[PDB]
């Protein structure tokens, strides 16, 4: 009778962007389409509402850039690109 599943419905974790497919071309439109198809709506019934919409995607950075890996790794990548040797061997060292 008093089914909790019908009373305690709340958005799941990572809800706003979970369905976003991994792509770089048009992530927001692609994510929007994925949400629409995931929700069970078919394009033939949504009509004109499906053409211009866009939704948040994981491929888009908070700054508004196309990202292909977690931002920490991007930070790690640039950091690792610059690591001069701590101790070097040269004849004139005192």
């Amino acid at each position: 009778t008093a089914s909790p599943a019908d009373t305690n419905v709340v958005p799941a974790k990572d809800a706003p962007t979970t369905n976003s497919p991994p792509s770089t071309t048009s992530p927001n439109q692609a994510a929007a389409d994925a949400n629409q198809q995931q929700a069970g709506i078919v394009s033939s019934q949504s009509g004109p509402n499906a053409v211009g919409d866009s939704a948040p995607s994981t491929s888009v950075n908070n700054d508004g850039d196309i990202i292909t890996r977690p931002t920490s790794d991007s930070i790690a990548a640039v950091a690792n690109a610059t690591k001069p040797a701590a101790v070097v061997s040269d004849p004139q060292s005192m």
């Binding site: 009373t7 305690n8 419905v9 709340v10």
Partner: protein
């Protein structure tokens, strides 16, 4: 639409109009009571404009 079809359509439409239904009564007099009650038990309260 010849005459026979015209009457047939008219008969069908008036048939739809004449049949009794409780749905309008339920909506005007009963449904709001249920909605008000249900609005206080869900975790997510109603969001309206």
């Amino acid at each position: 639409v010849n005459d026979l079809t015209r009457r047939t359509m008219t008969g069908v439409m008036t048939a739809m109009r004449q049949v009794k239904t409780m749905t309008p009564f339920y909506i005007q007099h009963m449904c709001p009571t249920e909605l008000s009650v249900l609005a206080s038990v869900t975790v997510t309260p109603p969001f309206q404009v």
